[PDB]
């Protein structure tokens, strides 16, 4: 089998992406932020605290005829940027893009944070990282893709983020036409539960190659780069007037500035992230401060390949037996 379902920008900015998933019987479609940095598939729901909706589409277990309550099952998760969500659990049919999943846990919301009721684009999050992460208790639960693996016509998935546009999610096969030139594939480790890799280095703007070793996590759910306080210094070096701003919490750039791209090794390959994607706007509105996309990881712990550069590339995420990654170029 196999699936494939459109993934639309949330704002201007791209600040994440959506794409629709159908839960139960007869569907209930949510719109959800599938995340390769994370293994819950949650939803806002009717057990929701009332005041924690905002806008939200909700899961509504109680019409769906195939919904099972897991008994005794309950979920909570904290997510990298302090957001997090907890509740109880169900079983239940869920598809995407025409691939379906019988027996899906399908954790729903008791409690959100303040961040995800601000947010009404956002029904939920599909997580895509390894199980080994799922926060489920006692018993813990598969991802959509783990359950779906053995069925899939090929074991991957693919991530094909638009910039400023909408994307696709493919599951099971690799669009050859959806890239340019070839896929290099780069070692995984999953001892974190993350798509786990090394890049072999960068480049700013047309300037040279530097070879060096940047471990870091594929994340379609960040939507920022995040990456060690030496390089993401050697780029805002090249912008005039940018300066890291403890206030505001990051590199900051004049919004007049035309911003250099940036590159990253994968393998003897090469990734070019356009200037242009590097800009999130200004830091408020009618600001002419504007917000840099690329950002230390100093003090997360962890370099984070996040949407700036993963919608540079078309994305393979092969869970063989090894698992790898491959980025081309599109």
């Known amino acids: 089998s196999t699936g494939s379902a459109t993934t639309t920008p949330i704002d201007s900015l791209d ?165 340019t030139g070839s ?21 700013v703007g047309s300037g040279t190659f530097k070879s060096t070793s940047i471990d870091g996590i594929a994340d379609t759910g960040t939507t920022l780069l995040y990456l060690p306080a030496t390089v993401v210094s050697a780029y805002w070096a090249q912008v005039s007037g940018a300066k890291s701003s403890s206030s505001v919490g990051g590199y900051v750039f004049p919004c007049s500035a035309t911003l250099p791209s940036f590159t990253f090794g994968v393998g003897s390959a090469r990734i070019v992230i356009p200037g242009d994607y590097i800009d999130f706007g200004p830091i408020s509105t009618g600001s002419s401060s504007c917000f840099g996309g690329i950002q230390s990881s100093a003090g997360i712990g962890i370099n984070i390949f996040g949407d700036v550069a993963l919608k540079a590339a078309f994305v393979v995420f092969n869970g063989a037996t090894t698992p790898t990654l491959g980025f081309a170029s599109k």
């Open 15 to 179: 600040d994440a992406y959506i794409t629709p998933v159908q839960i139960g019987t007869p569907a209930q479609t949510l719109n959800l932020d599938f995340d390769t940095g994370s293994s819950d598939l949650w939803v806002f729901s009717s057990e929701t605290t009332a005041s924690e909706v905002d806008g939200q589409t909700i899961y509504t277990p109680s019409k769906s005829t195939t919904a099972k309550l897991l008994s005794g099952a309950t979920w909570s998760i904290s997510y990298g940027d302090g957001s997090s969500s907890s509740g109880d659990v169900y079983t239940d049919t869920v598809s995407v893009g025409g691939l379906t999943v019988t027996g899906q846990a399908v954790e729903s919301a008791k409690k959100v944070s303040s961040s995800f009721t601000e947010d009404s684009t956002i029904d939920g999050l599909l997580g895509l990282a390894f199980s080994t992460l799922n926060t489920v208790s006692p018993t813990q639960q598969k991802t959509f893709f783990d359950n779906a693996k053995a069925s899939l016509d090929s074991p991957v998935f693919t991530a094909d983020l638009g910039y400023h546009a909408p994307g696709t999610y493919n599951f099971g096969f690799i669009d050859t036409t959806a890239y």
């Open 183 to 203: 896929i290099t594939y780069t070692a995984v480790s999953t001892k974190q539960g993350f798509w786990e890799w090394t890049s072999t280095g960068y480049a």
